[PDB]
Design a protein around this nucleic acid. Structure first.
Lengths: 81, 98, 91, 104, 78, 97, 106, 93
DNA sequence: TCCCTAGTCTCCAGGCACGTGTCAGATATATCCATCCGA
DNA sequence: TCGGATGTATATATCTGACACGTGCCTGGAGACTAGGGAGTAATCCCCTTGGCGGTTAAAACGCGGGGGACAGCGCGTACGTGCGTTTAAGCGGTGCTAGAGCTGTCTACGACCAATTGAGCGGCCTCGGCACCGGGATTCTCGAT
DNA sequence: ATCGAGAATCCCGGTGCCGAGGCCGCTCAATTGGTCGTAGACAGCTCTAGCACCGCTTAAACGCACGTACGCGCTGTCCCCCGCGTTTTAACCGCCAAGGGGATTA
C-alpha cells in the first residue's frame, strides 16, 4: 500500500498555490489545513469517479469519469474529454 | 549582501504565478496521492493518465479559489497573514462543511 | 392530481402508529418524494446516456443512489432496494 | 396482485413505473427499476418520518408539522447533507446562538 | 418606493432569527437592496415561465420552478 | 424604573424568533414590493396569493441564511455587531457578487 | 434533387441537421420542432462568436496570433455576462485573472 | 469509431470573426466542451419547459424561453435576436 | 441470439373526489418559578 | 449575594376546524399474449497503462538572522440597544365583479418514418511558419545610503 | 528629497521544432420526397379566484431621550514568518519490457 503521501503536497507547493491565489503572507499552520482540505476534496471527487467506473464495468478510471464526477458537484471542467 | 524586504519577494511571484498558467504541484506526488485515496474505494485501480491530469487541474483550481476567498476573509479581519481560521470561515460561508 | 399522500400516511403508521401528519407537512413530504424521484431518475438517465445504454435498470438506479445519497444513508438505501428487488424477483 | 405488495413496499410500483416511462428519461425502462426506486423512496420517507416523529414526541405533540420536519432534517448530518439546498417552507431554523454573543 | 415597506424592525427580526446580537444602522438599507436584487432574479424567471405558458397570472408553481432554477429548492407548494 | 443592561433583550429576541415559524415581514408590503418589481417585466401580471406567499418564504429563508453568514463574518473580525462590509464579504464568498 | 443544407438555408455556420439529430437522440422530448434546431444552432453560433471575438482580442493583447486556453480564460473572466454564465466552470490550463488586493500593496 | 466534434464550425466562426487568428488544440477542445455544455443546458431547460406545460414537442418557443432563462442580461437579448433572425430566414426558403 | 420489454386487449379494484364527526391543538387566565439588575 | 421585579413554564377550561374515516366510482394498474431488438456473452487486438532503471538538476528541506505583523492593553466618543408615548397602516370581516385559468370539440398543419441519394465531414498524411528557448543588451524597480 | 549599485524584467534577434493548418480519399449522415397518424391551434364555454373597495380594531412601526459598551485608533512586545544560503533528493526525462483490459465485432 501507500502510506501518507499527502506529505507530497509540500509546503512550497501550497505556498505557490496561495501566491497564485493572491496571498502575500502565510501562517505556518495553513499547510496542514490545506492538505486536509485537498484530501477531503479529492476523496469526494474520486469516490464519484470510482462509482462511475464501477457502473461501467471498467477497471480503469477514464478522464470522462473525472469530468462527470466534477460536473455532479458543480465544477464543470472544460477541455478534458 | 543585497537583500529585499520581507514584503516584496511576496508581491513578486504573485504577479508571475498569476501571469503564468502551469500547475505548481509536482506530478508524481499528486498521482501517488490520488492512488492512495482511491485504493480505499476500489483496490487495484489503473488511473488513466488524462484522469490524473484532470483531477490535478480541478484540485488546483479549487485550492486557488479557496485561497482567494481565504485572502478576502483574512483582509476582512484587518490582517494580512492567512490563518487556518480564515480557511475554515471561507469553507463555512461557501457551504462546504456546514 | 396524483400524489403520494396515502402512501406516506401508510409509512408513517408503520413507523409511528400513534402520531399524525398535518396537511402542510403532508404536502412537504409529497414535494420531497417528488424531488428525490426526479433527482434519481435524472441521474439514472444521465448514466444510461453516458454508457450508450437505452434502458434504465436496477443497476443505473443503484449507481444513482450511490452517487446522490450520503454514506450511511446511501448504504441503507442500497440495502433496501436490493432487498425489494430480490423479493420481487423470487416471488 | 399489486406489484407493491409482491415486493413488500408501500409506494406504488405501478405509479413509479408510469412516471419513469412518461418522464422521458430513457427509451425503455426495465422491470426492476421501479421496484428499486420505490424501495429507495420509501426508505428515505421512513427515515424522514421516523425522525420527525421523534422530534414531535420531544415536543410533546402527536402531529407532524413543517417545524418537526425541519428539525429532523437539520439535526441529522446526512439528511441535512442530502437537502442542503432545500427550503422547508414555514419550517423555521434550528436554534443556534454563538458562544461569543453569550454574556459573562 | 415599496422597498421602504421592508421596515427596520422587519430586518431586525430577520437578523435576530439569523442569530445577530448587534446590528449596524447601515444594514437596513443594504439588506433592502440585497433583497431587491434577489426578488428581481427570481421574479424575472417566474415571469419568463408565465410568458411561456401564455398566462397573465403568475402561479405559485412558476415561482417554485424559478427558485429551483437558481438552486434554492422550495418545499411545501408543489 | 427597571432597566435591562444592553443585549439581554436582544439575546431574548433571538431565542424567541429562532423558535417560531412565522414570517416576520408584513405580508401586505411584501406583496406590494413583489408587484412593483414584477411591473418591470410585464404590465398587468396578476399574482395569485400562493405565489406571493412562496416568494415571501423563499426571500425570508435567503435573508436568514445571509444573516447567519453575516454574523459569522462579523464574529470573524473580532466584532459583535454586523456591518455592511460583512454582508458584502458573505455575498462575495458565497458567489453572488 | 438539389440539396441546400439547412445551415445555409438558415444562414448559419453551425450544423442544423446535427443539432436536430442530437435533440432527437438526446431523449429531451417526444417530438422536435422544425425551427428548434435552427434556433439552437443560431444561439450556439452567436455564443461561440462572442467567445472567439474576445479571445482573439486578448491574443492580440498578448502579441500571439493563436488562441490558447489562457486567452479563453481572460476573455471569459474579463467580460461581465460571460463570467456570470460560466461562473461554475474551470477552463483547464487557463490560469487565473491577475488581481492583487490593494491592502497587500506597499 | 469516428468521434464527432464542433471543430470545423468553431474554426469557421473564428475565421469569420478574426480572419488572421489561429487556435490551439487545447483551446479547440475547450470550445467543443463549451458548445456541448451550453447545448445540454439549453436542451435540458427546454425539455423541462415542455414537461411543465404537458407538451410533447420542442418548438423554437421553448428554445427561446430557455435561452431567456439561462443567458444573463444583454447576452440573452442578442442571442434571441439572433435566433429569431435565423428561423424566419429558414421559413422563407 | 435470446430473453426482456414495448405495445395491445380485457378486466377490476385501489386510489382519488366527496361528505362528516370529533379531538389535537390554539387560546385565555391564573399560578409557579427561573433569571436579571442593583446596593 | 439576597431582595425586587420581570419574563418564561405549567395547569385548567373552552372552542374549533383540520384529520381521519366511510362511500361512490372510474380510470389506471394487473394479467395474458405477441413480437422484435438491446444487450449479455465470447473471442481478439492492440494500446495504453504499469513497472522499473540510469543520469540530471530544479526543487525541497534545513538553518539563521531579523524586521514586520499578530496580538494584547487603554482610552474615548459615538452609535446602537432599551424603553415610552404617538401615529399609521396591516390584518380581517364582508361586498362586487369580471379577467381569465381551466376544460371540451374540430381538424389541420406538423412532425415521424421510410426508401433512395450524395455531398459535407472526418481520418490520414505532409510542411512550413508561429512560438519556445537562449544569449545578450537595454530598461526599471528597489534598498541602503544621503 | 533624492541617488546610485544591484537585482529583476523586458526587448531584440537568432535557431530549431512541432503542430496547426491544408489537402485528398472515403464515407454515412444529412437531404428529398412521398404517406400518415395525430398534437395542439383555434374557437368556444364556464366557473373561480384575483383585483378593487370599505370599515373597524389594534398590533406594529416610529420618533425621541438616554445611557453605555464596544468599535476603533494608538502604543508596546514579542514572535514567527520571510528572505537567503547550503545541502540533499526525489521529480523528471529518456528508455525499455510486459501484460490487462478497453474497444471492437458475432
Amino acid at each position: 500500500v501507500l502510506r501518507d503521501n499527502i506529505q507530497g503536497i509540500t509546503k512550497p507547493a501550497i505556498r505557490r498555490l496561495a501566491r497564485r491565489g493572491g496571498v502575500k503572507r502565510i501562517s505556518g499552520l495553513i499547510y496542514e489545513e490545506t492538505r486536509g482540505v485537498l484530501k477531503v476534496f479529492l476523496e469526494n471527487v474520486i469516490r464519484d469517479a470510482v462509482t462511475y467506473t464501477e457502473h461501467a464495468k471498467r477497471k480503469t478510471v477514464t478522464a470522462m469519469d473525472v469530468v462527470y464526477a466534477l460536473k455532479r458537484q458543480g465544477r464543470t471542467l472544460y477541455g478534458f474529454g | 549582501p543585497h537583500r529585499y524586504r520581507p514584503g516584496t519577494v511576496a508581491l513578486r511571484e504573485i504577479r508571475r504565478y498569476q501571469k503564468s498558467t502551469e500547475l505548481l504541484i509536482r506530478k508524481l506526488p499528486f498521482q501517488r496521492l490520488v492512488r492512495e485515496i482511491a485504493q480505499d474505494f476500489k483496490t487495484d485501480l489503473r488511473f488513466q493518465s488524462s484522469a490524473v491530469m484532470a483531477l490535478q487541474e480541478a484540485s488546483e483550481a479549487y485550492l486557488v479559489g479557496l485561497f482567494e476567498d481565504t485572502n478576502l476573509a483574512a483582509i476582512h479581519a484587518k490582517r494580512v497573514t492567512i490563518m487556518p481560521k480564515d480557511i475554515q470561515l471561507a469553507r463555512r460561508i461557501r457551504g462546504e462543511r456546514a | 392530481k396524483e400524489s403520494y399522500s396515502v402512501y406516506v400516511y401508510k409509512v408513517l403508521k408503520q413507523v409511528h402508529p400513534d402520531t399524525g401528519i398535518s396537511s402542510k407537512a403532508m404536502g412537504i413530504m409529497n414535494s420531497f418524494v417528488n424531488d428525490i424521484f426526479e433527482r434519481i431518475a435524472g441521474e439514472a438517465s444521465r448514466l444510461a446516456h453516458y454508457n450508450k445504454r437505452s434502458t434504465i435498470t436496477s443497476r443505473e438506479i443503484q449507481t444513482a443512489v450511490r452517487l446522490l445519497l450520503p454514506g450511511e444513508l446511501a448504504k441503507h438505501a442500497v440495502s433496501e432496494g436490493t432487498k425489494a428487488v430480490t423479493k420481487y424477483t423470487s416471488s | 396482485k399489486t406489484r407493491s405488495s409482491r415486493a413488500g413496499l408501500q409506494f406504488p410500483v405501478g405509479r413509479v413505473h408510469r412516471l419513469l416511462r412518461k418522464g422521458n428519461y430513457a427509451e425503455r425502462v426495465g422491470a426492476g427499476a421501479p421496484v428499486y426506486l420505490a424501495a429507495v423512496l420509501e426508505y428515505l420517507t421512513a427515515e424522514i418520518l421516523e425522525l420527525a416523529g421523534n422530534a414531535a414526541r420531544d415536543n410533546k405533540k402527536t402531529r407532524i408539522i413543517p417545524r418537526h420536519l425541519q428539525l429532523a432534517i437539520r439535526n441529522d448530518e446526512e439528511l441535512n447533507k442530502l437537502l442542503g439546498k432545500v427550503t422547508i417552507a414555514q419550517g423555521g431554523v434550528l436554534p443556534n446562538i454563538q458562544a461569543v454573543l453569550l454574556p459573562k
